[PDB]
């Protein structure tokens, strides 16, 4: 599986400092293989570590019997269900590298992922609108003929994922890829018209999980609510569910971040940490204002907020109105995660996005032509380190743009750094809408819009929104009358996730040639 390696002097240093341990990610689970403490709670279901590891082995073995092999790829689409984790570990034990699509993703996104990775295996959920029947499956499996095996959650037919999980593995031995090779693919936010995949090696991903565990002080006492989409990296690894498993704690799954679902799960299971994006935080606080008892949240000790910038106003209200500590998390799937620390001053927790997890994360701020700027100045985030990738999968053209000559990645973010060394996020250069933490590549949607018979020119831009931070607005130059609902129905036909439909559509008599900077004025 081809990916961009670190230069040999970097690998060598990162091993010498102990960052790269050359253990597979399977070891996060197998170190607890003999434990009957609870690893996952999913509704009424409670899975121990012993059971979780046995389930992954059963699934792996079963897939192996069906002919799936090490070095192959898989496409997986599961939401906040225990079978996400079983599946992730089963594929790791086989040496098969998955993309974990979010439940919300639709035809265009799944098609794009499958086209790039040519998966031998598809795992999905009949609860998803695409997979309740067999029509789409038929089309999908025809247009991506690399697929040999299909397993489905909530199926009772011959493709029942549960039959595999429940089938005791006879004589199974795990064959994870080497630790310095690819374990799985993460998804980028998106800055371009086609999705970009981020190869993650065992060494590099395990380090980001293990170091996050130290910073967040997770142990067997950790009871972690995973309520945002579980397969996103913030939920998975910062420290996320994998950090919880590493530390032997418990992950409580919720279908979404609503107060209605989560206030009860927090009280019931005595959750002590969770992870939110800013709007979820406002909604929780407003739920408390509307009368939910604050006592349902007593057990909560740490709340992480990330994905988009938390305002200081909103941040301050957390210890006050909820009574736990805040941790700001400013991370990206490409690598680099900055944390405020548990012993930081209130000033740093409230006003900054923290600093890098690793002492050898190298972060500098560039001006427009690639030159360093002194501290305090606002500029482009440039970075490299032991868990930051060196290239998107099979994307030479785009890789040429995304990295400088020395291997620094440019995250498309504008930042400034404190005298004390802390990062504040000040704006953005990449052509991307951050809608309450979820990422929308404007060019992707603009390309889809131009496919409309009536649309001559298309621009997608973010607009301030109090709750969501940013909402999306499509500016169109049209041949003919065109209402928002027509655009939205059309896009939905193309098959994209709901969160990517424009919140707002305006037909305009003209647009500048599209010069978005000028449009903002």
Ligand X SMILES: N#Cc1cccc(C(=O)NS(=O)(=O)OC[C@H]2O[C@@H](n3cnc4c(N)ncnc43)[C@H](O)[C@@H]2O)c1
How many Cα atoms occupy the beta-carbon half-sphere of 10 within 13 Å?
A: 20
Selected binder of ligand X within 61, 303, 314, 337 (CB under 6 A): 337
Which lies closer to ligand X via its Cβ, residue 159 or residue 390?
390
3-state secondary structure 451-480: CCCCEEEEEEEEEEECCCEEEEEEEEEECC
| 356 binds ligand X per the rule CB under 6 A | no
Render the burial of 471-498: b for 16+ CB within 10 Å, e for the rest: bbbbbbbbeeebebeebbebbeeebbbe
| 94 binds ligand X per the rule CB under 6 A | no
Stretch that binds ligand X, among 91-99, 245-253, 259-267, 300-308 (CB under 6 A): 300-308
> What is the per-residue binding string for ligand X in 233-252, x denoting contact by CB under 6 A?
xx--xx--------------
| 436 binds ligand X per the rule CB under 6 A | no
Pairing label, strands 38-42, 250-253: parallel
| 307 binds ligand X per the rule CB under 6 A | yes
Stretch that binds ligand X, among 159-167, 245-253, 258-266, 325-333 (CB under 6 A): 325-333
Stretch that binds ligand X, among 3-11, 18-26, 130-138, 303-311 (CB under 6 A): 303-311
Which residues, in sequence order, are CB contacts of 418 under 8 Å at separation 6+? 352, 375, 376, 424
Selected binder of ligand X within 76, 90, 122, 425 (CB under 6 A): 425
Which lies closer to ligand X via its Cβ, residue 72 or residue 361?
361
Selected binder of ligand X within 79, 98, 176, 189 (CB under 6 A): 189
User: Tokens in use for 482?
Assistant: 């065109």
| 309 binds ligand X per the rule CB under 6 A | yes
Q: What are phi and psi of 474, to 5 degrees?
A: -100, 120
Taking the complex as a whole, how short is the minimal distance between the CB of residue 191 and ligand X, in angstroms? 9
Taking the complex as a whole, how short is the minimal distance between the CB of residue 192 and ligand X, in angstroms? 14
Taking the complex as a whole, how short is the minimal distance between the CB of residue 129 and ligand X, in angstroms? 24
User: In terms of Cα–Cα distance, which of 190, 289, 282, 226 is closest to 85?
Assistant: 226
| 411 binds ligand X per the rule CB under 6 A | yes
Which lies closer to ligand X via its Cβ, residue 413 or residue 431?
413
Selected binder of ligand X within 38, 75, 152, 329 (CB under 6 A): 329
Which lies closer to ligand X via its Cβ, residue 58 or residue 238?
238
| 439 binds ligand X per the rule CB under 6 A | yes
Give the Cα separation of 153 and 127 in Å (integer). 8
Beta strands per DSSP E along 355-483: 355-356, 362-366, 379-384, 409-417, 423-428, 432-435, 438-441, 455-465, 469-478
| 308 binds ligand X per the rule CB under 6 A | yes
3-state secondary structure 107-138: HHHHHHHHHHHCCCEEEEECCCCCCCCCHHHH
In 3-state terms the chain splits into helix, strand, coil percentages (rounded to 5) of 35, 25, 40
Q: What are phi and psi of 370, to 5 degrees?
A: 95, 10
| 328 binds ligand X per the rule CB under 6 A | yes
| 385 binds ligand X per the rule CB under 6 A | no
Taking the complex as a whole, how short is the minimal distance between the CB of residue 331 and ligand X, in angstroms? 3
- Report the 10 Å Cβ neighbour count for 447: 16
Selected binder of ligand X within 330, 389, 403, 408 (CB under 6 A): 330
> What is the per-residue binding string for ligand X in 251-290, x denoting contact by CB under 6 A?
----------------------------------------
Selected binder of ligand X within 26, 73, 296, 353 (CB under 6 A): 353
| 469 binds ligand X per the rule CB under 6 A | no
DSSP 394: T
Judged by DSSP in three states, 173 sits in coil
- Report the 10 Å Cβ neighbour count for 509: 6
Taking the complex as a whole, how short is the minimal distance between the CB of residue 462 and ligand X, in angstroms? 12
Which lies closer to ligand X via its Cβ, residue 159 or residue 380?
380
User: In terms of Cα–Cα distance, which of 517, 28, 511 is closest to 244?
Assistant: 28
Which lies closer to ligand X via its Cβ, residue 308 or residue 314?
308
Strand order in the sheet with 355-356: 45-48, 38-42, 250-253, 223-226, 273-276, 302-306, 325-332, 335-339, 355-356
Q: Report how far Cα 456 is from the mean position of its chain's Cα atoms.
A: 34
| 58 binds ligand X per the rule CB under 6 A | no
Type and span of the H or E element at 312: helix 312-317
Which residues, in sequence order, are CB contacts of 284 under 8 Å at separation 6+? 259, 262, 263, 276, 322
| 388 binds ligand X per the rule CB under 6 A | no
Selected binder of ligand X within 413, 431, 444, 470 (CB under 6 A): 413
Stretch that binds ligand X, among 305-313, 392-400, 451-459, 468-476 (CB under 6 A): 305-313
How many Cα atoms occupy the beta-carbon half-sphere of 399 within 13 Å?
A: 16
Bridge partners (DSSP) of residue 23 are none
Stretch that binds ligand X, among 254-262, 301-309, 396-404, 508-516 (CB under 6 A): 301-309
Count residues binding ligand X (CB under 6 A). Answer: 21
Q: Which positions touch ligand X (CB under 6 A)?
A: 189, 233-234, 237-238, 306-309, 328-333, 337, 353, 411, 413, 425, 439
């Amino acid at each position: 599986i081809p990916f961009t390696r670190w230069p040999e002097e970097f690998a060598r240093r990162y091993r010498e400092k102990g960052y790269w341990q050359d253990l597979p990610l399977t070891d996060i689970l197998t170190r607890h293989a003999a434990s009957d403490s609870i690893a996952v709670i999913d509704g009424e279901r409670q899975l121990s570590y012993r059971e979780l590891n046995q389930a992954a082995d059963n699934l792996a073995c079963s897939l192996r019997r069906q002919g799936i092999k090490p070095g192959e790829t898989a496409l997986v689409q599961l939401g906040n269900v225990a079978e996400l984790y079983i599946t992730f570990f089963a594929l790791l034990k086989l040496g098969v590298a998955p993309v974990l699509a979010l439940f919300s993703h639709q035809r265009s996104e799944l098609n794009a992922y499958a086209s790039q990775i040519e998966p031998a295996l598809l795992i999905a959920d009949r609860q998803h609108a695409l997979f309740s029947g067999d029509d789409f499956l038929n089309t999908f499996v025809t247009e991506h003929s690399s697929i040999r095996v299909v397993q489905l959650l909530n199926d009772s037919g011959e493709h029942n994922l549960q039959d595999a999980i429940n089938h005791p593995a006879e004589d199974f031995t795990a064959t994870p890829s080497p630790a310095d090779e690819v374990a799985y693919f993460q998804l980028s936010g998106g800055t371009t018209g086609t999705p970009k995949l981020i190869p993650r090696t065992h060494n590099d991903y395990y380090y980001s999980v293990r170091r996050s565990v130290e910073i967040c002080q997770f142990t067997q006492q950790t009871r972690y609510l995973c309520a945002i989409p579980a397969a996103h990296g913030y939920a998975m690894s910062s420290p996320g569910s994998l950090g919880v498993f590493l530390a032997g704690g418990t992950v409580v799954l919720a279908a979404d971040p609503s107060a209605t679902l989560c206030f009860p799960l927090i009280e019931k299971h005595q959750v002590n940490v969770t992870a939110l994006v800013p709007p979820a935080v406002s909604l929780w606080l407003q739920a408390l204002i509307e009368g939910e008892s604050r006592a349902q949240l007593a057990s909560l000790k740490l709340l992480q907020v990330g994905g988009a910038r938390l305002s200081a106003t909103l941040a301050a209200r957390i210890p006050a109105e909820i009574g736990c500590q805040l941790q700001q998390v400013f991370g990206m799937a490409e690598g680099l995660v900055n944390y405020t620390r548990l012993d930081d001053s209130a000033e740093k927790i409230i006003h900054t996005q923290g600093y890098p997890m690793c002492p050898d994360d190298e972060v500098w701020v560039a001006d427009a032509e690639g030159n360093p700027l002194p501290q305090g100045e606002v500029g482009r985030l440039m970075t490299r380190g032991p868990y930051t990738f060196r290239g998107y999968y099979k994307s030479p053209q785009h890789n040429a743009s995304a990295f400088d000559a020395n291997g620094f990645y440019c995250s498309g973010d504008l930042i400034s750094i404190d005298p004390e060394g802390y990062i504040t996020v000040q704006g953005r250069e990449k052509d991307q809408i951050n809608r309450g933490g979820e990422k929308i590549a404007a060019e992707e949607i603009e390309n889809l819009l131009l496919r409309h018979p009536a649309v001559i020119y298309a621009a997608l831009v973010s607009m301030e929104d109090e709750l969501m931070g940013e909402k999306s607005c499509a500016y169109l130059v049209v041949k003919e009358p065109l209402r928002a609902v027509q655009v939205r129905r059309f896009l939905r036909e193309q098959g994209i996730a709901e969160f990517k439909l424009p919140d707002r559509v305006e037909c305009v008599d003209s647009l500048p040639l599209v010069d978005k900077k000028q449009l903002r004025q």
